[PDB]
Scaffold this active site. Structure first.
Site, short mmCIF file in Angstrom:
data_model
loop_
_atom_site.label_atom_id
_atom_site.label_comp_id
_atom_site.label_asym_id
_atom_site.label_seq_id
_atom_site.Cartn_x
_atom_site.Cartn_y
_atom_site.Cartn_z
N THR B 141 -8.35 -53.24 -12.54
CA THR B 141 -8.29 -54.22 -13.51
C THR B 141 -8.43 -55.50 -13.14
OG1 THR B 141 -5.99 -55.06 -13.62
CG2 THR B 141 -6.12 -52.68 -13.67
N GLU B 250 -11.59 -84.61 -11.96
CA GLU B 250 -11.40 -85.51 -10.83
C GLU B 250 -10.50 -84.94 -9.58
OE1 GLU B 250 -9.19 -87.76 -12.93
OE2 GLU B 250 -7.72 -88.64 -11.59
N1 LIG Z 1 -1.85 -60.56 -1.67
C1 LIG Z 1 -1.34 -59.40 -2.63
N2 LIG Z 1 -2.47 -58.39 -2.89
C2 LIG Z 1 -2.20 -57.52 -3.62
C3 LIG Z 1 -0.59 -57.23 -4.11
N3 LIG Z 1 -0.64 -56.19 -4.82
C4 LIG Z 1 -1.72 -55.58 -4.65
N4 LIG Z 1 -2.58 -56.10 -3.82
C5 LIG Z 1 -3.87 -56.03 -3.59
O1 LIG Z 1 -4.38 -55.88 -4.91
C6 LIG Z 1 -6.04 -55.26 -4.42
C7 LIG Z 1 -6.46 -54.33 -5.61
O2 LIG Z 1 -6.12 -54.74 -6.94
P1 LIG Z 1 -4.76 -54.29 -7.81
O3 LIG Z 1 -3.88 -55.24 -8.54
O4 LIG Z 1 -3.78 -53.53 -6.69
O5 LIG Z 1 -5.49 -53.11 -8.81
P2 LIG Z 1 -5.52 -53.31 -10.25
O6 LIG Z 1 -6.46 -51.99 -10.85
O7 LIG Z 1 -6.01 -54.58 -10.69
O8 LIG Z 1 -4.09 -52.97 -10.85
P3 LIG Z 1 -3.45 -51.40 -11.01
O9 LIG Z 1 -4.91 -50.62 -10.80
O10 LIG Z 1 -3.28 -51.35 -12.55
O11 LIG Z 1 -2.44 -51.25 -10.35
C8 LIG Z 1 -5.73 -54.66 -3.24
O12 LIG Z 1 -6.76 -55.59 -2.40
C9 LIG Z 1 -4.34 -54.84 -2.66
O13 LIG Z 1 -4.14 -55.12 -1.46
C10 LIG Z 1 0.07 -58.33 -3.70
O14 LIG Z 1 1.35 -58.15 -4.48
N5 LIG Z 1 -0.20 -59.32 -2.89
MG LIG Z 2 -6.47 -50.37 -11.75
MG LIG Z 3 -8.64 -92.37 -12.30
#
Ligand SMILES: Nc1nc2c(ncn2[C@@H]2O[C@H](COP(=O)(O)OP(=O)(O)OP(=O)(O)O)[C@@H](O)[C@H]2O)c(=O)[nH]1
Ligand SMILES: [Mg+2]
Ligand SMILES: [Mg+2]
Ligand SMILES: Nc1nc2c(ncn2[C@@H]2O[C@H](COP(=O)(O)OP(=O)(O)OP(=O)(O)O)[C@@H](O)[C@H]2O)c(=O)[nH]1
Ligand SMILES: Nc1nc2c(ncn2[C@@H]2O[C@H](COP(=O)(O)OP(=O)(O)O)[C@@H](O)[C@H]2O)c(=O)[nH]1
Ligand SMILES: Nc1nc2c(ncn2[C@@H]2O[C@H](COP(=O)(O)OP(=O)(O)O)[C@@H](O)[C@H]2O)c(=O)[nH]1
Ligand SMILES: C/C(Nc1ccccc1)=C1/C(=O)N[C@@H](Cc2ccccc2)C1=O
Ligand SMILES: C/C(Nc1ccccc1)=C1/C(=O)N[C@@H](Cc2ccccc2)C1=O
Lengths: 427, 429, 123, 428, 420
Positions: B141, B250
């Site tokens: 997502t 800015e």
């Molecule tokens: N820095 C950081 N990275 C995260 C965290 N949780 C997940 N990730 C990273 O998120 C990346 C993938 O995106 P996700 O949000 O996990 O996947 P998504 O499809 O967008 O969300 P879902 O699939 O519904 O869980 C991977 O690189 C994971 O390491 C977090 O709390 N902090």
């Molecule tokens: Mg996902």
């Molecule tokens: Mg100014």
């Protein structure tokens, strides 16, 4: 999100039974009622494998198909007997035959629609059904034939949701029927186009783990089912437990499969035995890892040597330091760096859930897309065409309404899948 | 004037929750929304919160994810009281670690709703500035909805600029193999609808904690506390009213010399663990590959714009001579054609840390926003994986599956190739 | 030098007189210019009404910039409103018959299974 | 018979105001106009009480003309005779002549025609105006072109204020002088230049004044002018009428510019020293110091000389005094005109402004010489003009208001040629 | 005769504020009301800078333009706050951008007409409006972009009357925005064709006057405005005070500008911060005390005016004045003759017994333009930060079109180191 379970065939069912009562212990469920245990996690992800009914109660999301009474009243009369909802039982009455056709064509399709009727219920009841899983034998009709049918019909209805099977590849040594090769090749074909992952389980293995690695003389269908039951808990855990993954089953497949054919994870386990043999606590992490990465401990009868790992998952169990885990994990990839593929980059991820199984302080489960699986397929196809030769026992299917060339038509689909795996020792 | 946060995706959401939290400590809001300070009816910190009703202080944010699970643990642990049940959209089925699913298949359905629930929040704002999109680079997502959002936000909102905070993905604490595909996919559709974009290299954050915090194998909520601090030192300018960087233009008119080149490199100053440093020394940290925010090496690429964002107890009389001997000791490293930078931003508000957290209360902290050409090091360290897989169609079939096109992959690598080119094309004369 | 004076008048409150010293020894306005004063105005009126037609100039160029921008901006919105929902209805048609392409192979290991029972019940 | 004063431009106006004041003391008029033939030559006997000056005052700001309708004397003129004009000329001739001029000129010209109309046989006009500087150069120039048309024979005497770096403010000065002086000179008859620097000089040496004011300088010019006009106000032989003014002084149409020299400038505080001799004051007239335009006439040739005496003087004295102006000093006459000295006695003792700077004197003298050395200042100007136009310097402000790049060319041209006539009068 | 004041931009406004309260002191005006002071002069020429309203009262002739609330409620909330007539405040709401175009093209022209609306009703009220003066920055949009617009629109309406600005040429050291060179070159162009005099004020100078010449470590935008505030009072005085000049503003221009372009007076001051005549004069004729960052050495003075302040003997003044022109005779042009006039008004400023201000048309101002154009083409190079204007609706070549207008103005100043 939520998963149903179809468990079809004498070999499929008595596996199914042992599965259920082992996962039912982890969560802690009375042979009927509800929770009894000082743990509190369990129930987070009990949502997934248990559709809950009135009173206290918890009842599995299970369907049991067989083409004869016999083995159904084994479950209901045995261990965790009256746990499954009375009419989730799909009776057979007729023959089974140990013959693929009867199961996939005549006596199978005879039933089938009644199975689709329970499954359609549970899944239509199920609030976000993620997919199904299935258990069954591959040499022998009611499991291999009906189920391969089931799945074909399971899809089409459910394209949509992801499919999944523990199937039991049969060996020439330790089996009942002359014909099984025939039965196998026919379902193998079926599987390879219809499932999304398919845990390969050789009885050549399973029995070999017992006399090679146990000194266990007279191997039942008992202690031997035992392994499969364990290994199956292994694999399931992280859709059914922590919160340190989150394991979509889909995600789970996407990240596990490169090429849409070939979904043939040979698996493996950490510890072993049941009766008059132990472990002196010594399950250590190092000695756990170079154990779920030893062939002499694979669930298929391969040797994940001649053949290189496409993708590899492991999941670890026990309140232990994973600060040790990734350090041992690494170590295996370098002590055995050769035998991973380069062209998928980070192709061996592992995670850890801390609530142990029945017995055992520390344990590991290896899920495992090895092209050395080619080793297994090739073994059957070798005694298949060795039989389709002067077209021998074939006349049991001749007459059932199957075609002469229909055997050759799926003998071939297999020999592709051989040299695609061979075609993935690449660059 | 006003300022809306979007957080899509498990990673987005949790970074979010961990800096809306740190916003909350900074401006003194007790969880239930009410703050006992003389600064509400409905200036100064109204940039981010809205004084809705007669008591509370709701964040101007919207949270989106395609499972519940994560959004669920907001309507759970206190802060449950902080948002409006509206502002948290959940979506039943997952994206499954796959962009195509995120953009085209599962997206389609929820986008209309989100898009509009955002429009609610833009409507309680007299002269809205822009959006902050928090999201994960790789992953489902996060790459795929984010991409679709921006295409659409771009249409529904005119000038209104868009700042993204991407989470560049790192083998060690990931789980997903297919990662690279997803990043090079989004990043392509995404970049012509974005204005300036802070990348955050998970590896480099994992790095800081293993070295500077003594944490054995650090958690997510470990990593997020750290990012929470950095973001809040970037956004700091527009929240207390800053002596510099006081509006979105800015603020960044500063950073991006060319339409494409968004990607600034951040560097946070005194990360030090509870259980103090000189104005000089912390400046002299900002230029240390270790304390960096994206794993690379800027000592060898050219800098092409440099900001220093100070926070705490500091007289400029100090900042200066400190910089002076950044130039007579270390590596200057400037481009052929832009002055020799150093917009310098003083904010007297002492830096607050999360209570039983990992870090300690510091007197002064620094933040350096540099647009170096060495940050394209991670533009290839990605690319290369993507290359070495697609080379075999590797995982492709899962995409073509949900509905995508063999060539839309081609075409996105094409873009990085070309970008990787512009970034090289900015060296010397 | 000691000289003799020539007495040149005497009246109430004065007296004039020359005093020659060393003998001498011998050796169209036009009115028409008021049309000149409105030629001067000829060139003033030219100048000021030129730094007007050079100023009412730098004007409806401003008209441009101000809008030849906005005109070039929505020229992006209605470039990326179909770079979307026709890249995206290309998607809908795309997959939906990779569903069909999934299914119509089913009716065919299905209407194959049908016919070889109608063949069993004839063997 | 009659005699109208025009004073255009801040400088003009203030010289004016400081000599209408001195006329007033001389003829004994209390400010209100009432005094308890002859002097009807300047004032008119209007109404039954008052004695209005026959003057008109023009300036393009109010400011200066405004001072008049303020400090007593306010009672002395007719509200009509002071024309003011709203916006300034801004230190520039083009503006004076062409842009701001156009508008007011028709009015002034006619308000003058009011005063000429209460006069049976008018003589001519006295135009007081600043050489350099805006309205003074520009309006004066336009006035004269027009007065020249509206009035036939009727002669025109100008008193110009030749401009001096030390007490000026304007850089562009030279241009404006050389501009007017060109258009102006064929419409003029005889023209007394007054070098601000030379007057600033007299005060610094002879009056002990540190850094002298304008109203310091004007009291002085007021005395000199009133010794020049003297002739036609009391009626005493020689210069009884304006025609005589040229007949005696200007041998050649162009050469107008006579050099004046006033006799005993001495400061009260010295007011009781045994006052100077008929001899000594004559012997002053010939002293570059006491001059009226900064030059040196000891080296240029004189070509007509007048001595205008005022006070207690018997001619028997004047004579032998002159006698040894010859046998001692520099004779210095031209090839072809007698050896001058038309000598004018006026018995009216010279009056000074009451709490002024100078003292009551017994006898004063006034020497009007037409020397060819006065063209020294015709070049000392020219050169600045030259050295600026050389770079178009300030020109654009002119081309601006409406003027012509070439009208400048053409005016230097006239000076060049004048400077020439003035040289062409030496020897043979 | 009468002058209105436009004061546009964060830099332009906080200058305008300090200006006003310093001149308002000299005349002596209550933060609201009228006169309180034993002096009596003041009010002669108060006519010029203050349109007076009902009751007692005196209210400046001021318009305050900004493209955002922020800095306007600084004035109203600060020193001489509620002195300016409430609706002479032209609000902004929008962005400013620190970008020329937004201020000259989009967000600017958006307002503009509302400004013209106040100016039109002060100047139309004003009984003999002589001209306008304006204050503003040159790097940064709301001042440099709007104001350069303002002035173009202020002429055309008022050709007629003379224009005038204190503009603050930005430096690389002690500034906020990477882009300012772009902003400057664009208005420089604009100014050089629409103003009649333009006091150049470098912040490279202003800051330099503080650390080389004042032992003040951390120079605010405060003590630094302080100078401009002072220097501005200096330059105004003699339109607003004595009667020993009289200073038409036009006259004042005519005698200060030889050539219609090039009206770029670098200024300078006498004493400094919070005095003998000699040591005053060889002090307003030192570079280390000029308001532009030049050095009136490499570059000879076209014309030069100074105005002196203090009940002192000017009999000393012309004698010291002369002396500078001979001790430094070389460095004035010869071809304009009496090209350095000075005058003196005797009513001193806040503090300070004796002080002097130096207005100065020095071709060494070429030294400033060249410095900006040097970092300008150094940026227009591979056409850098330009994309912030690209998109605003400006032309590719429109930059080059005004980069050139400037390199003319350079080598015309260079072309006026000429010959006798
Ligand atoms: N820095 C950081 N990275 C995260 C965290 N949780 C997940 N990730 C990273 O998120 C990346 C993938 O995106 P996700 O949000 O996990 O996947 P998504 O499809 O967008 O969300 P879902 O699939 O519904 O869980 C991977 O690189 C994971 O390491 C977090 O709390 N902090
Ligand atoms: Mg996902
Ligand atoms: Mg100014
Ligand atoms: N003798 C004398 N000279 C003056 C006086 N005032 C100005 N000047 C000189 O006149 C020249 C400028 O002439 P102005 O009379 O001021 O110019 P204007 O256009 O006639 O007057 P304005 O209406 O003020 O512009 C300079 O050389 C001044 O020194 C004065 O009062 N007396
Ligand atoms: N491990 C496991 N394998 C079994 C079991 N029973 C049989 N098998 C093997 O799997 C094959 C298929 O099972 P079978 O019951 O005969 O097939 P059915 O026709 O579906 O009942 C047998 O032929 C055996 O080789 C079971 O007890 N567990
Ligand atoms: N001295 C003076 N200069 C300033 C001040 N504020 C900003 N500047 C300078 O003016 C330039 C930009 O002016 P700014 O006010 O930011 O632009 P604006 O508000 O859009 O007019 C910068 O180079 C600053 O160095 C101040 O108030 N006083
Ligand atoms: C991808 C994955 N596990 C895994 C996930 C993230 C990180 C490490 C291992 C699994 C797993 O543990 N079991 C299978 C899922 C499965 C298999 C059979 C029945 C139900 C569910 C799978 O794909
Ligand atoms: C030329 C001159 N003064 C001056 C005039 C004659 C002799 C000495 C100084 C001035 C002056 O004092 N102020 C400026 C006019 C001005 C311009 C802008 C704002 C206020 C005033 C000027 O040009």
């Amino acid at each position: 999100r939520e998963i149903v379970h179809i468990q079809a065939g004498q070999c499929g069912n008595q596996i199914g039974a042992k599965f259920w009562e082992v996962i039912s212990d982890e969560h802690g469920i009375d042979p009927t009622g509800s929770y009894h245990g000082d743990s509190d996690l369990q129930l987070e992800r009990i949502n997934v494998y248990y559709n809950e009914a009135t009173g206290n109660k918890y009842v599995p999301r299970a369907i049991l198909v067989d083409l004869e009474p016999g083995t159904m009243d084994s479950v209901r009369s045995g261990p965790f007997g009256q746990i499954f909802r009375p009419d989730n039982f799909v009776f057979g009455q007729s023959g089974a035959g140990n013959n693929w056709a009867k199961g996939h064509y005549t006596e199978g399709a005879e039933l089938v629609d009644s199975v689709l009727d329970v499954v359609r219920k549970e899944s239509e009841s199920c609030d976000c059904l993620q997919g199904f899983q299935l258990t069954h034998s591959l040499g022998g009709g009611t499991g291999s034939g009906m189920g391969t049918l089931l799945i074909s019909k399971i899809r089409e209805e459910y394209p949509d949701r992801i499919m999944n099977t523990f199937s039991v590849m049969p060996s020439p040594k330790v089996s009942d029927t002359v014909v099984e090769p025939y039965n196998a090749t026919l379902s193998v074909h079926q599987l390879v186009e219809n499932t999304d992952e398919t845990y390969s389980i050789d009885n050549e293995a399973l029995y070999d783990i017992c006399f090679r690695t146990l000194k266990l003389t007279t191997p039942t269908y008992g202690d031997l089912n035992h392994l499969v039951s364990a290994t199956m808990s292994g694999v399931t855990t992280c859709l059914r437990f922590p919160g340190q993954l989150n394991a979509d089953l889909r995600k789970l497949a996407v990240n596990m499969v490169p090429f849409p054919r070939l979904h043939f994870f040979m698996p493996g386990f950490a510890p072993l035995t049941s009766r008059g043999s132990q472990q002196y606590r010594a399950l250590t992490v190092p000695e756990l890892t170079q154990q779920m990465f030893d062939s002499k401990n694979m669930m298929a009868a391969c040797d994940p040597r001649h053949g290189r790992y496409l993708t590899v998952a492991a999941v670890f169990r026990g309140r232990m330091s994973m600060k040790e885990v990734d350090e041992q994990m690494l170590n295996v990839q370098n002590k055995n760096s050769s035998y991973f593929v380069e062209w998928i980059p980070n192709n061996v991820k592992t995670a850890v859930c801390d609530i142990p199984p029945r017995g055992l302080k520390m344990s590991a489960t290896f899920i495992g897309n090895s092209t050395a699986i080619q080793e297994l397929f090739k073994r059957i196809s070798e005694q298949f065409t060795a039989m389709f030769r002067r077209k021998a026992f074939l006349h049991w299917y001749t007459g059932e309404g199957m075609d002469e060339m229909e055997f050759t038509e799926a003998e071939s689909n297999m020999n592709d899948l051989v040299s695609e795996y061979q075609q993935y020792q690449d660059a | 004037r006003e300022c809306i946060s979007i957080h899509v995706g498990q990673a987005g959401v949790q970074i979010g929750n961990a800096c809306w939290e740190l916003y909350c400590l900074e401006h003194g809001i007790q969880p239930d929304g009410q703050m006992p300070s003389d600064k509400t009816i409905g200036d100064s910190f109204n940039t981010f919160f809205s004084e809705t009703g007669a008591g509370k202080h709701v964040p101007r944010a919207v949270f989106v994810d395609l499972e519940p699970t994560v959004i669920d643990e907001v309507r759970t642990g206190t802060y449950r009281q902080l948002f409006h049940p509206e502002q948290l959209i959940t979506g039943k089925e997952d994206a499954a670690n796959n962009y195509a699913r995120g953009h085209y298949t599962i997206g389609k359905e929820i986008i209309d709703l989100v898009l509009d629930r955002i429009r609610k929040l833009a409507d309680q704002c007299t002269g809205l500035q822009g959006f902050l999109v928090f999201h994960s680079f790789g992953g489902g997502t996060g790459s795929g909805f984010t991409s679709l959002l921006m295409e659409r936000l771009s249409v529904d909102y005119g000038k209104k600029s868009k700042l993204e905070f991407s989470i560049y993905p790192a083998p060690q604490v990931s789980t997903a193999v297919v990662e690279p595909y997803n990043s090079i996919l989004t990043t392509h559709t995404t970049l012509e609808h974005s204005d300036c974009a802070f990348m955050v290299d998970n590896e480099a954050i994992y790095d800081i904690c293993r070295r500077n915090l003594d944490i054995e194998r650090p958690t997510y909520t470990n990593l997020n506390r750290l990012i929470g601090q950095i973001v809040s030192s970037i956004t700091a300018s527009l929240r207390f009213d800053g002596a510099l960087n006081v509006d979105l233009t800015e603020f960044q008119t500063n950073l991006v010399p060319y339409p494409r080149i968004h990607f600034p490199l951040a560097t946070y100053a005194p990360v030090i663990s509870a259980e103090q440093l000189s104005v000089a020394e912390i400046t002299n940290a900002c230029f240390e590959p270790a304390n960096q925010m994206v794993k690379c090496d800027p000592r060898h690429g050219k800098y092409m714009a440099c900001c220093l964002l100070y926070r705490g107890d500091v007289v400029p009389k100090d900042v200066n001579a400190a910089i002076a001997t950044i130039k007579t000791k270390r590596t200057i490293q400037f481009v052929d054609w832009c002055p020799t930078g150093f917009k310098v931003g003083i904010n007297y508000q002492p830096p607050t840390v999360v209570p039983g957290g990992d870090l300690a209360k510091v007197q002064r902290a620094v933040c350096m926003l540099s647009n170096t050409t060495a940050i394209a090091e991670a533009w290839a360290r990605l690319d290369h994986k993507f290359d070495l897989m697609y080379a075999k169609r590797a995982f492709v079939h899962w995409y073509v599956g949900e509905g995508m096109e063999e060539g839309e992959f081609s075409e996105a690598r094409e873009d990085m190739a070309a970008l990787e080119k512009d970034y090289e094309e900015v060296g010397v004369d | 030098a000691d000289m003799e004076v020539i007495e040149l008048n005497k009246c109430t409150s004065g007296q004039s007189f020359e005093v020659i010293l060393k003998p001498p020894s011998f050796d169209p306005s036009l009115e028409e210019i008021q049309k000149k004063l409105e030629a001067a105005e000829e060139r003033r009126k030219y100048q000021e009404a030129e730094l007007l037609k050079h100023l009412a100039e730098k004007r409806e160029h401003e008209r441009e910039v101000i809008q030849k921008a906005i005109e070039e901006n929505n020229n992006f919105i209605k470039m990326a409103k179909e770079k979307l929902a026709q890249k995206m209805e290309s998607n809908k048609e795309n997959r939906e018959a990779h569903l069909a392409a999934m299914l119509e192979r089913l009716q065919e290991k299905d209407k194959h299974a049908e016919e070889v029972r109608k063949n069993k019940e004839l063997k």
